[PDB]
Design a binder for these strands. Structure first.
Ligand SMILES: [Mg+2]
Ligand SMILES: [Mg+2]
Ligand SMILES: [Mg+2]
Ligand SMILES: [Mg+2]
Ligand SMILES: [Mg+2]
Ligand SMILES: [Mg+2]
Ligand SMILES: [Mg+2]
Ligand SMILES: [Mg+2]
Ligand SMILES: [Mg+2]
Ligand SMILES: [Mg+2]
Ligand SMILES: [Mg+2]
Ligand SMILES: [Mg+2]
Ligand SMILES: [Mg+2]
Ligand SMILES: [Mg+2]
Ligand SMILES: [Mg+2]
Ligand SMILES: [Mg+2]
Ligand SMILES: [Mg+2]
Ligand SMILES: [Mg+2]
Ligand SMILES: [Mg+2]
Ligand SMILES: [Mg+2]
Ligand SMILES: [Mg+2]
Ligand SMILES: [Mg+2]
Ligand SMILES: [Mg+2]
Ligand SMILES: [Mg+2]
Ligand SMILES: [Mg+2]
Ligand SMILES: [Mg+2]
Lengths: 386, 67, 136
RNA sequence: CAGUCAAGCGUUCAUAGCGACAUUGCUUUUUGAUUCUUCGAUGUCGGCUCUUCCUAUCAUACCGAAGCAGAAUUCGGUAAGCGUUGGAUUGUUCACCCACUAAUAGGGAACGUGAGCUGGGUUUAGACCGUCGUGAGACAGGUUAGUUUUACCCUACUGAUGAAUGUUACCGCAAUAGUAAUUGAACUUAGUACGAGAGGAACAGUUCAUUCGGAUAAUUGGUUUUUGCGGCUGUCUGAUCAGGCAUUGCCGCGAAGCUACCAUCCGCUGGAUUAUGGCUGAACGCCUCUAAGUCAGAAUCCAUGCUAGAACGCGGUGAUUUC
RNA sequence: UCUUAAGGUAGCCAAAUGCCUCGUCAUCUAAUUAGUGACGCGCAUGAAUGGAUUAACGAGAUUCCCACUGUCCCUAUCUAC
RNA sequence: UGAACAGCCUCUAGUUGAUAGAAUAAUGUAGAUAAGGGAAGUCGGCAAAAUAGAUCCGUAACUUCGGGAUAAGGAUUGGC
């Protein structure tokens, strides 16, 4: 017979399979549409998720009850040291999809980037790009020819860049290498830009701007094998249920004599790649600056790093991007930040944001103070002090 | 913004921190954390708890401010 | 909310499912209110309709004058006792649940209010705001 | 459940909406008829949980017609994408009420689903009553108590490794499969259009909210074997300090982690169409959205985007072993 | 008025005994096929086949109320095996 | 300790026997805690929670006068 009472589904059928992602770095499956009129610039960036914090900003929205009145929101902070442009690759369109035809690398590679090419760096001759380095040392024979080959073809040009993992508090020591499409114009100008930027660094403030409406791409936090009740949010069986109750009662009817693909079942939860959209940037922080957490109203020399450092991460010595909302993935994970695909006015994506105060209290508990100066002022002197 | 003062322990309360309690007689009590709130729910006298600002002021500890 | 709802309210945590009994905060002579429905609530399997501060509910009186018993009437919740987050960032709650009796248009049956009321409810029902002593 | 004719109803008026006397049909969610399969056993009602499908569409999208001034309402079309509730009584399916809601539409999948649950009913053995029987006993008459077994096998599903493709590593492409967002309210429009008055909208814009989904832990709450700090009982270590035991002795607080519409954030825009309304224009010198041609258009379809990446699909790139 | 050997008296009831039946009225609830109190031409109650009450007692059957609580809204976390 | 051959700890005496090691996924069995609400769940408050000792106060209807009755409902409890 029919279902006694109608109810919506559990979970989303468009997010299958809930298997582990291919790699720890999520891959950008689409880039902003290219307009061959603006200058050549990156369309994405690489960063690391440090932690979340609390922000105080005056909401400005004509019509709302809190118009021109103060509100409190939660944001996440992403460490973004500048990336190194090492190599570009061209893509030529084919009736079978885009195909990469050639790759041109830089003459010199740092230690941290080529460690990606070794599963055992400590016992190795470290002969990476050594004969490719010998492709240089003559003016342009093997390199300028490949660049011209890219120019004659390859309607889409992407740039291979890698993170400076040594600047972060992480002890991974291995850089992350990724591709970013250039959305300038005149692909010859694109490859000229790329070649000029070989062995050169690019700071995040050259890509993203305040109030810009951006997107986050990262692998979510994994949780191992998970029961159906938490994996899909199904109703728990009553208390007096034999043979367990954290299950699904009926997994299918008699016919078809098979288990449907749409029935919630136990399996690995999390560690999936997700693309989260519409997250407004609030502050573009500079690591070469004290008082990172100081606003025009706070005016106290304090960095974005809380007391005792970000939980499980450390400090933010580098430049950072602090975006409203929460982004997928936990702390210490590589995250890829992307420009928005479409122009969104929405009268909230055009909102101008000016911060007031940054919660720099220790996240290791019910933090009371924001600065050791403030702690000393409040508590007074102690036995440890002299 | 304005930084609140804990009704129980006197500790400074920053925005979005702690819980606010309105008693039936319309008096408001702000607690910086769950600890102070729970102690308040047990009718503990702030003057008897050794780490509250009221206790320290009443017992003349670090009171070198006023001469 | 509904007919007398002058304006909109941000979402606040639901703390009063149906079957809950709350104190009567007015002078109409009712002692308590029995919730049987919430105006503007959605529908879902096995999800109990829940009431929050300032929502108009379909309520019934269990204790009071006999003229108020044995009949259903609209009501407006004025005290929650469950913490909810205001958009200024603070979590606040009263010590008990409380409501008042009103007509479908929001005109309060009683004339006075005992104890404080939530600013969210007062801002939304002008008649409740008029008769309220202390508003927070 | 749906048609065909049209004597009448409808102030006139068959067909706005109905429609008698007749007649043609469809379905197998009723109940019948039969006994084809199963009596060396296919676990029978109902409820709970869950998925998908059908459309004879309750609401939402877009339209057509009215005995459509407005509002409300009725009939009909494309439409199954999306949703269709919380309770009182009854074992109930069914039914009747209370209330909210945009709505509380109808059905199938061995009258879906018991090695998924329950056992309230029916339907063993105990027992009571009424009627019947002389009696043993009978009663789709009533009542009460009455054991719910096994999956380690194959397949399916969910996840998880994996040989061979000279080796290894890195960066990619995208065939194919899946797909998602949904609905309401308030303000303004506007007491305006319309209406004698009574009453009384909509288009655009704004703030939110319902249901659903994916994340996340800055804050709040929960969680305590951090056995982290403190306190308390009985006993033991001669006393003190410090400790053992009481299956974590008990109580208060309690970081980290996990976690909650009990917490916060986010949830895209293009084309082609359905119904329908149009253009030119014959057939048919007139006329016609149609025949050739053609314009706009729905929550529809395919795309953008999102998810896996063929473990026998593919590309680029680095290095490629010396007693 | 026919008729039996006598024609259900005292009592009691939609009761564990009533098909119609979810009987009718009142109360109980926002809403009750439940419960209780009444009515009784009672298919088919009824007197040691024992009738009617009945304090106390009951791992007996049923209804409501107060306190209580993860039974539930709506799930989450912790320990041992 | 305590009313107590109750439960808990110890003395004499007797054992240290029950296949072990390594991790801490799902579902389990056993033990628990949960904000707001409080039976709305369910055939049915099933299960669980709540009360609990002692001292003092107070204790209804009904009744076979014996009970009901620890009725109900309150207050106190340590150490010196
Ligand atoms: Mg079914
Ligand atoms: Mg259905
Ligand atoms: Mg979740
Ligand atoms: Mg069982
Ligand atoms: Mg923390
Ligand atoms: Mg806490
Ligand atoms: Mg249910
Ligand atoms: Mg047969
Ligand atoms: Mg047979
Ligand atoms: Mg057989
Ligand atoms: Mg079978
Ligand atoms: Mg149709
Ligand atoms: Mg059938
Ligand atoms: Mg089965
Ligand atoms: Mg029997
Ligand atoms: Mg017998
Ligand atoms: Mg006989
Ligand atoms: Mg029989
Ligand atoms: Mg496809
Ligand atoms: Mg916690
Ligand atoms: Mg024409
Ligand atoms: Mg008899
Ligand atoms: Mg003694
Ligand atoms: Mg003893
Ligand atoms: Mg053994
Ligand atoms: Mg129910």
């Amino acid at each position: 017979s029919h279902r006694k009472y109608e109810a919506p589904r559990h979970g989303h059928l468009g997010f299958l399979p809930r298997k582990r992602a291919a790699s720890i770095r999520a891959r950008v499956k689409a880039f902003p549409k290219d307009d061959r009129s603006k200058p050549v610039a990156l369309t994405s960036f690489l960063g690391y998720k440090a932690g979340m914090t609390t922000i105080v900003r005056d909401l400005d929205r004509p019509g709302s009850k809190f118009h021109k009145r103060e509100v409190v929101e939660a944001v996440t902070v992403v460490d973004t040291p500048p990336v190194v442009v090492v190599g570009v690759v061209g893509y030529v369109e084919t009736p079978r999809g885009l195909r990469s035809l050639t790759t041109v690398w830089a003459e010199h590679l740092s230690d941290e980037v080529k460690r990606r090419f070794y599963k055992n760096w400590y016992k190795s001759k470290k002969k990476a790009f050594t004969k490719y380095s010998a492709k240089y040392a003559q003016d342009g024979a093997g390199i300028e020819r490949e660049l011209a080959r890219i120019k004659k073809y390859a309607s889409v040009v992407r740039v291979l860049v890698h993170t400076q993992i040594r600047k972060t508090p992480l002890a991974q020591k291995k850089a992350h290498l990724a591709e970013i499409q250039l959305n300038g114009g005149s692909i010859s100008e694109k490859v000229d830009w790329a070649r000029e930027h070989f062995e050169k660094t690019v700071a995040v403030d050259s890509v993203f701007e305040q109030n810009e409406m951006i997107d986050a791409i990262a692998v979510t936090k994994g949780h191992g094998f998970e029961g159906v009740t938490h994996r899909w949010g199904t109703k728990k069986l009553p208390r007096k249920t034999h043979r367990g109750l954290r299950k699904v009662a009926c997994i299918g009817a008699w016919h078809p004599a098979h288990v449907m693909w749409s029935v919630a079942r136990a399996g690995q939860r999390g560690y999936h790649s997700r693309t989260s959209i519409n997250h407004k940037i609030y502050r573009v922080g500079k690591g070469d600056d004290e008082a990172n957490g100081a606003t025009s109203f706070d005016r106290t020399k304090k960095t974005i790093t809380p007391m005792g450092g970000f939980v499980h991460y450390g400090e933010i010595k580098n430049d950072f991007i602090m975006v409203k909302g929460c982004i997928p993935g936990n702390r210490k994970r590589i995250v890829t930040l992307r420009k928005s695909l479409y122009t969104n006015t929405s009268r909230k994506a055009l909102e101008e944001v000016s911060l007031k105060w940054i919660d720099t209290a220790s996240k290791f508990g019910k933090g009371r103070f924001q600065t050791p100066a403030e702690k000393h002022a409040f508590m007074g002197t102690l036995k440890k002090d002299l | 913004m304005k930084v609140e003062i804990d009704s129980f322990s006197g500790a400074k309360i920053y925005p979005g921190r702690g819980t606010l309690f309105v008693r039936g007689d319309s008096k408001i009590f702000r607690f910086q954390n769950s600890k102070s709130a729970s102690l308040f729910k047990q009718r503990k006298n702030p003057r008897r708890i050794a780490w509250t600002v009221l206790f320290r002021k009443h017992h003349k500890k670090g009171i070198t401010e006023e001469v | 909310s509904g007919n007398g709802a002058q304006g909109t309210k941000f979402r606040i945590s639901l703390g009063l499912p149906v079957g809950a009994i709350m104190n009567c905060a007015d002078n109409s002579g009712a002692r308590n209110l029995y919730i049987i429905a919430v105006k503007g609530s959605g529908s879902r399997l096995n999800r109990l309709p829940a009431a929050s501060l300032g929502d108009m509910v379909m309520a019934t009186v269990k204790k009071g004058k006999p003229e108020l018993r044995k009949k259903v009437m609209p009501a407006i919740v004025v005290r929650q006792a469950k913490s909810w987050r205001r958009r200024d960032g603070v979590f606040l709650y009263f010590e008990d649940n409380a409501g008042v009796i009103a007509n479908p248009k929001g005109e309060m049956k009683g004339s006075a209010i005992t104890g404080p009321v939530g600013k969210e409810c007062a801002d939304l029902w002008p008649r409740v705001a008029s008769n309220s002593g202390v508003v927070v």
